[PDB]
Amino acid sequence: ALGVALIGTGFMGKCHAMAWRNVATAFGGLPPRLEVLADMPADKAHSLASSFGFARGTADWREAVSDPAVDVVSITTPNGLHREMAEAALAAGKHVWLEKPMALSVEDAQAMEAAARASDRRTIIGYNYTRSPAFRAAVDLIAEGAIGRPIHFRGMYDEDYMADPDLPWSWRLTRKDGGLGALGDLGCHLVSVMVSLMGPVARVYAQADTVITDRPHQGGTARVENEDQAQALIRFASGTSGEFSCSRVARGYRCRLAWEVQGTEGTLRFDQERMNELWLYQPGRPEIDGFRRILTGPAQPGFAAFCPGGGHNFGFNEQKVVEAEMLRQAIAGRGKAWPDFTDGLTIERVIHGMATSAQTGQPVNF
Amino acid sequence: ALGVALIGTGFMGKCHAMAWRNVATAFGGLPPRLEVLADMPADKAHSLASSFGFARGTADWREAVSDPAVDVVSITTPNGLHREMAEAALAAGKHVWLEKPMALSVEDAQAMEAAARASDRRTIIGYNYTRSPAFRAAVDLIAEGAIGRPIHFRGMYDEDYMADPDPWSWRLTRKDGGLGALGDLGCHLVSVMVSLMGPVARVYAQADTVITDRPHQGGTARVENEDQAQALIRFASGTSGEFSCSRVARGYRCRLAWEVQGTEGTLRFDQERMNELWLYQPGRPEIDGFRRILTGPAQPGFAAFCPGGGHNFGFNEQKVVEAEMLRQAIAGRGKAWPDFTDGLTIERVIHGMATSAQTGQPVNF
Amino acid sequence: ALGVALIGTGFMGKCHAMAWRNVATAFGGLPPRLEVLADMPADKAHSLASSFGFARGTADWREAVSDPAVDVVSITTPNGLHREMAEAALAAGKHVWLEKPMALSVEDAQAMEAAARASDRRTIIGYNYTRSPAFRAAVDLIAEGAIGRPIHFRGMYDEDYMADPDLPWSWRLTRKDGGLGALGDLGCHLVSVMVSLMGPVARVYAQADTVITDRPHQGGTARVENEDQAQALIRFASGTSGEFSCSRVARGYRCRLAWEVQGTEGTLRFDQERMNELWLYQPGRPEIDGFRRILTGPAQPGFAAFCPGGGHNFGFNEQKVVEAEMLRQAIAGRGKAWPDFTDGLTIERVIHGMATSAQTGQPVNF
Amino acid sequence: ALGVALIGTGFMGKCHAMAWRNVATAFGGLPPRLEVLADMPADKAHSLASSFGFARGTADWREAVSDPAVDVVSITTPNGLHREMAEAALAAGKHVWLEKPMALSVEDAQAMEAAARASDRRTIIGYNYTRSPAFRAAVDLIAEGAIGRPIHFRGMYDEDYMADPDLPWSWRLTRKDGGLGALGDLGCHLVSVMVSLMGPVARVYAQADTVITDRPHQGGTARVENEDQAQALIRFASGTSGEFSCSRVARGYRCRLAWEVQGTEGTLRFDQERMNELWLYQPGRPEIDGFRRILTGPAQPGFAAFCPGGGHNFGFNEQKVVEAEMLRQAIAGRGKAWPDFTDGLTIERVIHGMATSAQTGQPVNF
Ligand SMILES: NC(=O)c1ccc[n+]([C@@H]2O[C@H](COP(=O)([O-])OP(=O)(O)OC[C@H]3O[C@@H](n4cnc5c(N)ncnc54)[C@H](O)[C@@H]3O)[C@@H](O)[C@H]2O)c1
Ligand SMILES: NC(=O)c1ccc[n+]([C@@H]2O[C@H](COP(=O)([O-])OP(=O)(O)OC[C@H]3O[C@@H](n4cnc5c(N)ncnc54)[C@H](O)[C@@H]3O)[C@@H](O)[C@H]2O)c1
Ligand SMILES: NC(=O)c1ccc[n+]([C@@H]2O[C@H](COP(=O)([O-])OP(=O)(O)OC[C@H]3O[C@@H](n4cnc5c(N)ncnc54)[C@H](O)[C@@H]3O)[C@@H](O)[C@H]2O)c1
Ligand SMILES: NC(=O)c1ccc[n+]([C@@H]2O[C@H](COP(=O)([O-])OP(=O)(O)OC[C@H]3O[C@@H](n4cnc5c(N)ncnc54)[C@H](O)[C@@H]3O)[C@@H](O)[C@H]2O)c1
Ligand SMILES: O[C@H]1[C@H](O)[C@@H](O)[C@H](O)[C@@H](O)[C@H]1O
Ligand SMILES: O[C@H]1[C@H](O)[C@@H](O)[C@H](O)[C@@H](O)[C@H]1O
Ligand SMILES: O[C@H]1[C@H](O)[C@@H](O)[C@H](O)[C@@H](O)[C@H]1O
């Protein structure tokens, strides 16, 4: 069994834990051994290792990535910590499951990518919205020619977690430790999905905005630095056109990663807030012509490992189980995992390229 | 930590396995120990006990219920085994997580309800559709007066797994399944309905078998029970109700959809979109209409799985919540619903409906 | 050109006026001659006669009905006035376009039916939800065998126009002017749709409720004389099962006439609040299997006469234009108007049979 | 009564006819007298003038614009004739209801604008998607402060009427006729809506494609000369951002003019294919937080003129009756008609500016 370390226990830390714990339940093989949990403070690491079923808990992550019983390290700590912990893991000869985005900057991502290439260990970044059965059915459909040649992509990713202007400031909202705003938190997820459907991005023209430029900082106010929303027009390497957006201030949306691929012979549309539906249009006779609602079931990739009956809604967390497995297969030498630090660095260059574009009012070519 | 035995590894068996494995991960406390898994043949039981992380797999269910390390038994076998397995598990001093419906008959459920009181062990029936954050949110809203006085209920549960020509399940026999759509789906619809409306007083029902033989069985494969059924309800309150279920309603996969029309509002839900609760309350005319409430941390259960609203809660995660309730009842910190007593009433409703359909007569409770 | 008389100018009266005005615009032939309009008081009739484009107004309907420049009469007055007005019109040798339901009782409907047969004039009842391109396409699809044989019908008609208890007492709530409550006002519509799709009703078992027992009336407090809601289980002459309901207190719904036909080889589903969509499931390959959203367009009956492009939503009022056209054609002998007073009589026996079942607690066979 | 001439009887011609016959029926006043109808050949004009309720049909549009009994002229002919016809109507001192877009080029629009100012006659351009009860409710909800300050617009207009590559090379596909492609046919309508929500446009950056470049043409094939789809990033004069697209080859879509405004305090979203629904998000307590589905009814502007009860879906064609009313009110010197040829000119510069941008690869500033 694969020896597992986990660093962090928050939103993603718990998600990885629940995933590791059931990956063998779903897909077979041996359950991974949950060796070490790292979080701060110590008493919290001990508590959570107990209730997560980990063999021990530590307040010292370096110990976790060092442990001889570990082969793989889940890294679910804040973006400013990714580079250091990732690199230390790879140097200790461990495979790495790293949360997105890779780091704060393209330069950090590049350093990490070089580390990974040296190491010969397997890596994967936590672009979990590419794990849904519906998204994977969509990719297969386009490959099968269900919509002919793609002629346009339109995608968005709206959430409203920062829309309230009273929400307190933090260094996340600075360029340092924070990095990009909406592009770094959400943009990257959209790019991960978009390039899987349409191929590599050849060019972007973008614009960005900070809507809420000043926030309470225990007293007066602090200037928010990164962007609350960004949009971009795209040209892919195939030459086809695309539209792109992201926002952390789009009121009423909670997880609205929504995309569509219009093709010569059809159209596919999807909204993550209803992650179990794939809308497919193909030309038919006039009398019955129209979009089909394909409800996620065992006909789609990965679904049948969790449930034999269609229409039993596949959940967000279960995406993470599929991700664990893809890494599990890569480590077992049986299948390449996407995206690794090399694949992820391209995604980093895209979102940062869009940021550069926005600042300059000039298109950026990749 | 609770010792767990699991009987069955099919649709619901595998579901219970995933739930027991993550109950503590979501809700804290100590993770349950996965002790014994039972299924046939033995080779299958062995491989799956290993992948599911169970200490052993066996082809002998009695071995699972008698393991001293076990405190609780998940029974996920065909309906025709529920009674024997549940009564054995109770007599063995184990708490029971029994899959719905209880058994083949009301008499069976009567026997099991008596045993459950005698055992002084906790019981819960697998009505996992009452565990969604959206559903739990609805109940709380109604109790708050959000929709005022419930004046009508309209409920359905449509699926189409029997509509497919390609097959043969135990669900189609009287000795393995019992009732057809009413036993396999109807009961779920009842569990939801009485949780919203209070107990049933009267039913008038009708039923049909639309596919009499399983096309690809070689031999005769007579469907021994109903493919669909509908009923008018009167609740103990005096309120009206519409009820139906079907395993042949083509294009539906898990369409357990209900609504409660109140004097002050309406609540509506469809399990195919289990993350949405529609709420209408009267407002200013210029902004009047139903609200799509997207499941999130403000709903019961959800926060334990995710701090961000809109990250769709899953079918399988309803089962994690179900497990947590049994586990809280087991610790004397809550009361599990429905136990074998509450479940008995449910069996009466669906079997009353089946009777009403057989006789062309109303049935009172 | 056909000579028109119109009695009433409210909800349906204005609908009828608008329909006659554009019937020839839509379908060709000669525009009807808008001859006489009748409403009270007189000032109101002459005023609306002017704005509706009618040659004259009057406060006395009887004159309008026997005016020799009139060939057809639209009757859009409360239910209590239907029988008298229709019987008078027919006996003058005029065709009649009558608002639903026929009158207060089954006896009224039998009286009206007899008068119509003796008069040898055309009649049509205003069941306008049978006139939508989506509905008519549904009936055709069933006929062509798109969903095999029907095995179940589930229908409802929810509105909340009496859901607020403060709303004033109105004629729809009296047995003298309305007759039945939600069964008379909404239920009849549901039946007209249901029988078009499933065939005749063989049996019903029903229950009914008055949720708001009293209402403000000028001074205050008046008792509601008929039902706010009703439901019924149906057996059709075919043997097939049905579910049926209606309500005027169903909070949040405005025109939710929603039905579905579940067949052996597919399913059809419709909701009048989205009267441009017809949902059709037929079995398909697993990977693309699901309900189609058919958007109303020129391939559906009647639509091409209003617009040559699909997706330009056909409206409520245009159903009435279709309805006038079917009446014109019938009067000219080139078509059948459905439902006439005879077909209308059947509809009335169903709804009153439901009322009876509700009162007795026993099934009612037809 | 207003004297009305109508030129053209097709898609919009017939829609204008239906609108002029019921404008008074809906909003009171005197019914406009339908004087002259022009279309070709003559026999068709005679036939349709009879069935449209027009006093006479003619094959010569110039006759209609000069008739002394005419006060206002509807112009529903292809784009290349708009300039000529409008300028002539105005020269004869007639009021003008002109179909979109104004013409083939900015230059044309400039001349027509000056022509319009030179006469002292009313003009309105046929941007009917701004007449819907839902849209007008949206605008008033914003003006009422419903969503705070707009911070982003996302708009699209997808149709597939050109998706089939075997459709014959026809007028919307030419420069000399047609002008722009998707931008001139669908884009303009999106801008009409967009500037009504976000105000004027400061800057665009756009991309465009011809996806089907060749089409059957009398035993041969001809080159398509304008775009099938276009997209743009927008910077509004207010400093706010926007996304914009249109397409005539977006498979499955029939009239998908969908738009969204995300504000500091709320969100509004709309889709013409369901023109009777308006989605509104305002912050609520978390228990009941979410988008409201607002079903078009009497609370929304214009609706009560057509129907006293909500839910009775307002049609595409009834947008035009509203448009007619707005014009009658402007002629009567009450309400002003938007957009006139001056507001229209701006919309033309925008769509042509996107076209320029897409052609050159450069941002275009206004
Ligand atoms: N893939 C996805 O869908 C997704 C979703 C949410 C967050 N994320 C990513 O997950 C990462 C964490 O996000 P989150 O929402 O879980 O943040 P969080 O604040 O919920 O959790 C951070 C975790 O890291 C721990 N931590 C912080 N500093 C530490 C240190 N020095 N040593 C050990 N532990 C430390 C915290 O105590 C906590 O356990 C971020 O990189 C974010 O981008 C990804
Ligand atoms: N709550 C739910 O949503 C849900 C879903 C599916 C089934 N169910 C209920 O759960 C139960 C199981 O249904 P399922 O769909 O998982 O059926 P299934 O056929 O998929 O699984 C049944 C399992 O029981 C095992 N089994 C059969 N006979 C056995 C024996 N003699 N000893 C030990 N194991 C035996 C089978 O080998 C199989 O592993 C039924 O009671 C059903 O009504 C509930
Ligand atoms: N088919 C449909 O979709 C539809 C929709 C709404 C109403 N209806 C039916 O239309 C009919 C009228 O409904 P409504 O909502 O228009 O009612 P309403 O209250 O709007 O109008 C009643 C009309 O009758 C007139 N009236 C009353 N007494 C009269 C008399 N003695 N002489 C002349 N005119 C008289 C009133 O002045 C008014 O014009 C009813 O039978 C109702 O069932 C049908
Ligand atoms: N606002 C909308 O929703 C909408 C919808 C469709 C079209 N349009 C616009 O309406 C206009 C017409 O498009 P359509 O789809 O109605 O085209 P169409 O081809 O359906 O009809 C064109 C009409 O113009 C007539 N015509 C052509 N040359 C003429 C001449 N010399 N004299 C008189 N009549 C002549 C044709 O006979 C026909 O009646 C275009 O400018 C288009 O952009 C707007
Ligand atoms: O598919 C159905 C349904 O999904 C229920 O959840 C399950 O309990 C039934 O046994 C199964 O037959
Ligand atoms: O709003 C309702 C309903 O829309 C019916 O169409 C109409 O016939 C009723 O009389 C009216 O009350
Ligand atoms: O079908 C399209 C579109 O629906 C618009 O309504 C119209 O203005 C266009 O000209 C027509 O091409």
Numbering used by the authors:
A (entry chain C), C (entry chain B), D (entry chain A): 7 to 372
B (entry chain D): 7 to 172, 174 to 372
Question: From the publication, what sentences describe this entry?
Answer:
The enzyme, therefore, turned out to be scyllo-inositol dehydrogenase with L-glucose dehydrogenase activity (P. laeviglucosivorans scyllo-inositol dehydrogenase; Pl-scyllo-IDH). Further analysis showed that the enzyme oxidized L-glucose to L-glucono-1,5-lactone as the first step in the pathway for L-glucose metabolism. Pl-scyllo-IDH formed a homo-tetrameric structure in the asymmetric unit, and this structure was considered the biologically relevant form, since a similar unit has been observed for myo-IDH from B. subtilis and GFOR from Zymmomonas mobilis. The N-terminal domain adopted a Rossmann fold motif for the binding of NAD+, and the C-terminal domain bound substrate.
Since Pl-scyllo-IDH also oxidizes scyllo-inositol and myo-inositol, the complex structures of Pl-scyllo-IDH with scyllo-inosose and myo-inositol were also determined. Both inositols bound to the catalytic site in essentially the same manner as each other, where residues K106, Y135, Y163, E165, R178, D191, and H318 formed hydrogen bonds with the hydroxyl oxygen of the sugar. All six inositol hydroxyl oxygens were involved in hydrogen bonds, including bipartite and tripartite bonds making for a total of eleven bonds. On the other hand, in the case of the inositols, R178 was positioned inside the active site in order to be able to interact with the substrates. In the case of myo-inositol binding, based on the shape of the electron density map, the 4’-OH formed a hydrogen bond with K106, which suggests that the reaction product is L-epi-2-inosose. myo-IDH from B. subtilis is known to oxidize 2ʹ-OH of myo-inositol resulting in scyllo-inosose production. Therefore, Pl-scyllo-IDH may have a different regioselectivity with myo-IDH toward myo-inositol. Therefore, L-epi-2-inosose can be a substrate for Pl-scyllo-IDH, and the enzyme is highly possible to be the first enzyme catalyzing reversible oxidation of myo-inositol to L-epi-2-inosose. Based on the crystal structure of Pl-scyllo-IDH complexed with inositols, side chains of D191 and H195 were found to be oriented to K106; on the other hand, in the structure complexed with L-glucono-1,5-lactone, the side chain of D191 was parallel to the sugar plane and extended outward from the active site. The corresponding distances in the myo-inositol and scyllo-inosose complexes were 2.8 Å and 3.1 Å, respectively, and the relative positions of NAD+ and the inositols were the same as those seen in the lactone complex.
